[PDB]
């Protein structure tokens, strides 16, 4: 029933543009819409991937590992699964993998790989494979892991009970002023629901 | 250590805004960012997405999502029933009502989080998620009456939180539709739990 009429350029960035979208609603009426899209995107099925790290120790409980950044957006500084665009030619996988690296020191195995899922879909086309990962944090790979933040990168490495998420993330945010991901908190809500 | 210094307008439409921040990395050195903010914050977050936990008896309990087309996306998305909090509403106010206008249910407020980041790589744009239970057996939940505002147009789908993550990748498979990443990250967690 819906969908679009045309996509007018209202404005481009080197990274972000804003675009006029013209579109047909279920009633058959034309109307717009403001769409935020990246200039990045190019035949990846998604803008990026976000990992979701399990690490694995014998005798230890499970943990998620976490990143925290500042982010320019929102001026300040947030807690986030790894994550970062995938680069022209590779796999979701492949970013998954070389992003929770470079991120967090961290050698991962794949697990599972969703399909491209959206970010924000009431402002913006961007997409996601959101990438399960597991870490032998036995393997001696996975002992006294150094990231490798790329040019302009600055990350700090938080792991947190995988049974406690939730109220984990709750002490960081009472202590801290930071703000948490949207699809952390959902992950840890789900966990605590089950 | 890291701070914005100034924030340059790049362009401004009715609902977005494209803006060049310049801020500090932790080095000393300044640098830039492309940030996208919505025009309509006052609020806690510009948003509320609701969590809604359909509990009958005698069935399993059910999370309500729904689906709609999405401009920016320029497809259909199924998501957690979401909408902007109206100045000087509250997060669980708004959750209620989004709740009641998307799907007709009427729920009752389980928990709220703190604000959460949407995608703060590029946006400021911040919700509230609000976990709810609804009473299906109740009489007011028997045909539930969806009042959407101007312009939405919502299907309801409702599925069994103990196989959600199965029944999304079917209707990806199948429908082609997107999966929102917050949906998908919670129906993850539903599996990963103990
Ligand atoms: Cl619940
Ligand atoms: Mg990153
Ligand atoms: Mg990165
Ligand atoms: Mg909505
Ligand atoms: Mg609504």
Redesign the pocket.
């Given at each position: 029933k819906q969908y679009i009429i045309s996509e007018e350029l209202i404005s481009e960035g080197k990274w972000v543009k804003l675009e006029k979208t013209t579109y047909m609603d279920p009633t058959g009426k034309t109307r717009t819409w403001e769409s935020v899209k990246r200039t990045t995107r190019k035949e990846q099925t998604a803008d990026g991937v976000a990992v979701i790290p399990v690490l694995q120790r014998t005798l230890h409980y499970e943990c998620i590992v976490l990143?925290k950044?500042f982010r320019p957006p929102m001026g300040g500084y947030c807690i986030?699964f790894?994550?970062?665009l995938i680069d022209d030619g590779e796999t979701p996988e492949a970013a998954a993998l070389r992003?929770l690296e470079?991120?967090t020191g961290y050698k991962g195995d794949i697990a599972e790989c969703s399909p491209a899922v959206c970010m924000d879909p009431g402002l913006s086309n961007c997409t996601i494979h959101i990438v399960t990962v597991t870490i032998n944090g036995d393997d001696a790979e996975n002992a006294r892991p150094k990231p490798k933040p790329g040019d302009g990168?600055f990350?700090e490495v938080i792991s947190l009970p995988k049974n406690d998420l939730l109220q984990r993330l709750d002490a960081l945010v009472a202590e801290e002023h930071l703000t948490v991901d949207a699809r952390v908190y959902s992950y840890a809500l789900a966990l605590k629901h089950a």
């Open positions: 990143v950044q986030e790894p994550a970062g992003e470079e991120e990168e990350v």
